[PDB]
Structure formats: C-alpha cells, structure tokens
C-alpha cells in the first residue's frame, strides 16, 4: 500500500476506519457524521505520512497544518487535536529525531523507569520528550537488556534479539531510518543435514515439510473445529495435539492396510470356493467320461436305449465341460485381481525413523520460534498474534542490534549497576529502593510520581521474588504472571579465521538423532561480515545445555560441522560465546509465550496499571501509580523488539495523559 493509506498501514492502523483508541479521544467525531470521520481519517493518515516521509526531524503542529490542503486545513482545532493525539501515543515523533522546539526548560512530574531495555528506553524518550523528569534504573552495566551484542575485534554477534521480522508496518522500519543499522536480508533457503552429516534430498525435505505444515493445520482444525482444548481438566497443549494428530495418522495407515489385506482374503476366498467347485466338476467329468467310454465299448449295432446312453452321456459331458470352461474363465479374472491388489499395497508406514527425525527438526524450529517445548504452548492461542505479522523479508542487524538501545540511551538519565529491590507505591506517590550490583549493601531511594516497570516476565516470576512490591501486586496481576509462559532459547557464537561453509547460504539445519535432542544445535546462521557461525539451542535442549560447559558445547558444534563440511575443513574456533538466558538473573529466560491455560488476554492484564488504596480512609480514588511495559505486555506483538518498543510508547502515552493531562480530548 502507498500514499496516505500506506502511512496508515505502516503505522498498523486501518486507513478507512477509526480505531478503538481514536474513538476514546474523538468521541464527538466517531459518533458524529460520516463526512467528518473521513476528514479526520485523512488528517490522521496525512500527518502520519508526513512523519513517515521524514522521521529524522520532529513534525510540529505548524509544519503539519502548513502542508495540509482545503477543506482539511480549514478546521485547526481538529488538526491540532489529531496531531497532538498522534504525538502523545508515539505514532509520530518517536525514537531519535532532531527537535525543533528545544525541550521545555522546567519539567513536570517525576517518573522512575525500571530497566533500560528497549521498552524502558522507548518510554523514557517519550516521557522526557513530553517534558517529564525521567530516570531509568538498570541492574546491568549496559543498556538494551535482552538486546545483547557480542563484540570483540571485528566479531559481532547478537546473543539476544537478532532479526528484524519484516519492515512492512514495523515501527523498527522508522527506527532503522533514524539509526545507522546495517540491515541485510535473510535468504530463506535452508539445507538440512542428517545425523550422518549428509544432506536430506529435496524429495524427502519437501515431503516432510509439507507433512509438517499439514500437521499444524490439523492441530488448528482440532482446536477451532472440534473444540479439543481440555483434556482431563488440563488445557490441551500444542505438543499433545500434534501427537494426537500423528497417532491418528499412524492409525489410519494401519486402518488402510487392514482393509486392503481384508480385500485380498475376501477375494482369495472366492477363489477357494471356486477351486472347490472346480475340483468337484473335474471329478464328475472324470467319472462321467469313464461311463461314456464304457457305453462306447458296446459296439454297434445296438438297440435304442444303448444308443441313447451314448448320446445322453455325450451331452451330459459337454454340458459339464461348458461349466468347467466358464469356471476357468472366472478363475482367470479372480487370479489376476489378486496380482492386482498385491501390486499396489497402501503406504507401509506413516513415517520412517529418517522421516520422524526430519519432522523433529521442524518441531525444533517451532520450539525455537516460541522459545519453548511444544508441550507447553497453548493449543488454541499459541499463534494468536499471527494476524499482525509484518510484511517483507526478515533482516539481520549486521553491525549488531545493540546499536539501537545504545542509540536510544543517548540523552537519558540512566543509572547502570542499580538493582531494584523494592517498589513502594502509595496514594501520594512512589519510592523505589535499589542497590549497587557491585557492593550490594550500598542502598538507594528514589521518590517519584509514577513507576514504569519493564522487568522481564521471568524476573516478575522469580520465586522467591527478586523485586518486592509494597503493597503486593493484586491477585489478578500475579495470576497473569503465573499463567503466562516465559520461554528459553540460547545461542552459540563460533568465530573462525576463514569461511568454510556455503557463503551464499545464511541458515542451515542439523537434524538431531532423537526427539529429546531435537533442539540441540539444530540450526546454524551465517549472517555476519566476519567469519562467524551462530548455533541455536532450542526446545527442551536449551534448558539443559545451560548446565554444560562451553567446551563441551563447542565440541558438539565442531563435531556437527565436521560431519557436514569434512573433518579437516573445520578448524579450531578463535573465539566462542555461549548464552544462558534462563540462568541470567536479569532475564530468567528469553521471551514469553502463550502457555497452555493462558491467552493473549493475559498480556493485556500485564499492561494494566495499578492504583494504590487511599492513604486517609474516605479520601477519593487515587491516580494510578504503577505502570507496566515490556515484551510480555503487548498482546499483538509479544516476544519481540518492536513489540517491546511499542509497549514503551504505549505506557509513555498513558503516563503523560495521566500526569500532564490530555488537552486533545475536548
């Protein structure tokens, strides 16, 4: 899409319809006449376009009105309302832009932001941009959180986020124009290599993959069409459902063999009855011919009865010979109908051990994409976010993804090495207690109007708690924290002195030996300028490999590589790095997934701010004080950088509305 309508699309908005959010701010318009709505929609789409055409400079209300046409530029209170709305909710002027109107000299309100991850940073920038007092508290000695980038010499490899999942409607598409990211397209082609160290042929490869995709649609069919979602009170997982489907497919293959061989017996038994009748006829014929012969022995001239006997027996014999020939006829048809059915048996097996192994690689891939054993994913909802997939080729940040959080961090009050221990929120404001990660007995206290919590879900999950909430988070929030899944996936960075793999190939799989190890070093990435191969550890393997030393891991890495590329083409690696996200105390995992028994709705619960009780009893309902951003809070874009980024923009909007007032709603 292009024009003003491309801008709406690129901003994840329907170009010809007002969103629920827009209805909330412009209820005069959306309940009003259709004419005004289209004026509104155009002004919105047009302003978005203007921002999108040039995201390196701030788009002011003046600049916007300047480039609008009659009849649209006539009503300025509308144009002003629209522009302000877009700016507030970070649809325009977000990320890193050059300001035209230098920041308000004195700030209003004070916000503490926990964590300088991307969601944290994105909010910080917005709030500071709205003229608020913002300070981020990061436990790590670096920004970006789950955007980690290994750097040494010229070796650059992301141990965290690595892929931009398409620029079509991606907020990262704007960020990429603002920040020097080197975006290289990822060539889709991925050759698999069995345990032996030799390629799967295109024959197999395609027939397994197509079976895999067939198997998924099947699970989708069990979920939505057969309502197969609860089993012994427990919510049905995807893994479960995939098994149930494979089983039913194995069952059917047998059902087919039975009914085919059952065709053989039914026919082979018709032949039996016929051969029996045939033996009994060659029996009567044998004896009847004897009698005719005995009557022909009585030499002429004979009387008429004796002549009759000869004639009679002759007729009776040719009558029985007619039948035997008609039965040798029938025998011929049935005897070939057997070589017919024995020529084409149905399928021998559903899948062989070679097949089931390649299919397991495809399962490993899904386990990687969701950073979790498929036995944990919700059947009904594991892909609830599919509709909001971006368009275009997936890309890599060739200069390392960290270039983004670092870029966003510029200009912000960030306290590194500062581990938040306790968040206290009350009717009259909040205080945050953090310590110094280095010498931990050294304590800090922060007073603020509001707290923005961007703590990873795995962190919020910690038992016993890493961060204490005073008063405790309400049960509706903590149940959402429990129900939700927070997965795990790890990366192995292999740095060499030379390329020894197909340089025109970005990714190539390794098929594991067992179901149990299907995610163990199952995939390899050739993405970077330097000679680096990156190796994924997904599924159940991810959680176990964290207990294994780097050498043992790199050993298996080299072994696999030798198997594929020849035992002497694979040298000893110059530099190696192994991630351990579940072990990492500031993550406690990689990213969230829709666990079985959760839904996309739990993500909304995560995003809902907390409003403390009143100080003095009988005093009015307070302002909300505790707010949440993060990958785990954005229903339509979970588990991603853009999603985090967007959630940060979301909360900054909401916080500003709350503490600076929304002038644009009148």
């Amino acid at each position: 899409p292009s024009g003003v309508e491309g801008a709406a699309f690129q901003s994840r908005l329907p170009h010809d319809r007002m969103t629920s959010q827009e209805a909330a701010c412009f209820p005069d318009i959306i309940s009003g006449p259709q004419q005004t709505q289209k004026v509104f929609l155009f002004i919105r789409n047009r302003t978005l376009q203007l921002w999108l055409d040039n995201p390196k400079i701030q788009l002011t209300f003046e600049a916007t009105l300047q480039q609008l046409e009659a009849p649209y530029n006539s009503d300025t209170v509308l144009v002003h309302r629209v522009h302000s709305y877009l700016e507030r909710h970070g649809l325009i002027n977000f990320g890193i832009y050059k300001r035209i109107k230098p920041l308000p000299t004195k700030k209003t309100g004070k916000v503490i932001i926990i964590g300088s991850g991307v969601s944290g940073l994105a909010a910080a920038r917005q709030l500071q941009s709205f003229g608020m007092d913002v300070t981020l508290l990061e436990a790590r000695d670096r920004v970006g959180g789950r955007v980690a980038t290994f750097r040494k010499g010229n070796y650059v490899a992301d141990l965290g986020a690595m892929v931009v999942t398409g620029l079509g409607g991606n907020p990262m598409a704007v960020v990429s124009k603002q920040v020097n990211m080197e975006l290289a397209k990822i060539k889709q082609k991925c050759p698999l290599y069995e345990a032996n160290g030799q390629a799967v042929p295109k024959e197999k490869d395609e027939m397994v993959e197509q079976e895999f995709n067939r198997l998924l649609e099947a699970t989708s069919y069990l979920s939505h069409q057969l309502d197969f979602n609860v089993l012994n009170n427990k919510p049905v997982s995807l893994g479960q459902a995939l098994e149930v489907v494979i089983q039913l497919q194995e069952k059917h293959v047998k059902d087919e063999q039975i009914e085919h061989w059952k065709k053989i017996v039914k026919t082979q038994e018709e032949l039996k009855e016929l051969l029996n009748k045939m033996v009994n006829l060659k029996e009567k014929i044998k004896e009847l011919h004897q009698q005719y012969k005995e009557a022909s022995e009585v030499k002429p001239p004979r009387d008429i009865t004796a002549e009759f006997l000869v004639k009679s027996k002759h007729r009776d014999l040719t009558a029985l010979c007619k039948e035997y020939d008609e039965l040798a006829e029938t025998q011929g048809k049935l005897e070939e109908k057997l070589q017919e059915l024995e020529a084409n048996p149905p399928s021998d097996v559903y899948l062989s051990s070679r097949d089931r192994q390649i299919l397991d690689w495809h399962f490993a891939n899904l386990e990687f994409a969701n950073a979790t054993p498929l036995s944990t994913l919700s059947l009904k909802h594991w892909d609830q976010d599919d509709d909001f997939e971006f368009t275009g080729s997936h890309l890599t940040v060739r200069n390392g993804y960290s270039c983004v959080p670092v870029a966003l961090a510029e200009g912000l009050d960030i306290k590194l090495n500062t581990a938040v221990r306790q968040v206290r929120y009350t009717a009259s404001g909040c205080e945050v207690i953090a310590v110094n990660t280095r010498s931990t007995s050294q304590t800090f206290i922060y007073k603020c109007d509001a707290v923005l919590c961007t703590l990873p879900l795995g962190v919020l999950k910690q038992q016993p708690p890493a961060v204490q909430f005073v008063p405790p988070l309400p049960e509706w929030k903590t149940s959402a924290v429990q129900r939700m899944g927070f997965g795990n996936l790890n990366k192995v960075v292999l740095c060499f002195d030379r390329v020894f793999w197909d340089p025109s190939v970005n990714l190539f799989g390794h098929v594991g030996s067992t179901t149990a190890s299907r995610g163990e070093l199952f995939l390899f990435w050739n993405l970077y300028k330097a000679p680096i191969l990156l190796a994924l550890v997904a599924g159940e393997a991810a959680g176990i490999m964290e207990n294994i030393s780097d050498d043992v891991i790199v050993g298996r890495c080299l072994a696999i590589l030798k198997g594929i590329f020849g035992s002497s083409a694979v040298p000893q690696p110059k530099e190696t790095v192994v991630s351990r996200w579940r072990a990492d105390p500031w993550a406690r995992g990689s990213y969230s997934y829709v666990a079985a028994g959760s839904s996309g709705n739990d993500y909304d619960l995560m995003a809902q701010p907390i409003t403390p009780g009143p100080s003095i009893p009988g005093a009015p309902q307070p302002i909300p004080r505790l707010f949440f951003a993060g990958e785990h809070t954005i229903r339509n874009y979970p588990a991603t950088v853009h999603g985090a980024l967007l959630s940060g923009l979301r909360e900054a909007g909401r916080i500003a509305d709350q503490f600076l007032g929304a002038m644009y709603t009148l």
């Binding site: 039975i258 082979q268 035997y324």
Partner: protein, 133 residues
Amino acid sequence: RKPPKGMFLSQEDVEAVSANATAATTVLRQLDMELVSVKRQIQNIKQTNSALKEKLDGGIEPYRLPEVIQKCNARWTTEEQLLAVQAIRKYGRDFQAISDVIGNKSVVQVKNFFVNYRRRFNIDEVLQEWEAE
C-alpha cells in the same frame, strides 16, 4: 470446515486415542495384531488354494469329446422318436438337452414333437414320471 486432504481426524477417533495415556499405543497394537492375524490367514488360504490348484492339473483335457457337427433335419426316424421319449423321461422340459441328445433336431422341433406325438407317446405320463424324481 474440513481437515487438510488425506489427513484423518474424525470426532470419534480423536476421543479414542486420547481416552487415556497409552490408549494410543493400545489401539495401534490391536491393529498391528489384526494385520498379522489377517496376513497369516492369507498365506493359509494361499496354501490351501495351491494344493487345490494342483489337483486340477492337466485340466479336463483327456476328457473332452470331439465335436458332433450334424445338420438339423426335419423328419423323424423311429430312432429319433425313441431317443426323444427317453430324453423326455430323463430331462422333462429341458428342450435344449433333449435337442442335444437327439443331435439333429432344433429346440423348436423338440417342442413341436411334444404336441404332435403327445397322445401316441403318452408324454403326459412320461413327464409326470420325470417329476416323480
């Protein structure tokens, strides 16, 4: 509305494989045995039919009698009439058989005979005695 084509997922089957933990492995074994059960039954009848096939060896070859090619006549030699009476006694209304025995009389001439020599050859009595067997 429907599964992917060739995939089998009936409401009934789904419940059967999920009824317990190894109800999967149970049903897959019932069929594995049902197959082996039928498979040996195949070789059993294959064996039986092989023996029956060999007892039919040579066919009915040393038993066929060369073809009697004779032109259909209209007149009744006393011979032919007497052949007929006995054929009726042995075949009843099987005009085809009676025709084949007499050799040179058409299926209709046989039927004609029935009404012509009806009184003289007491064909009523002859036929009623054919039925008596």
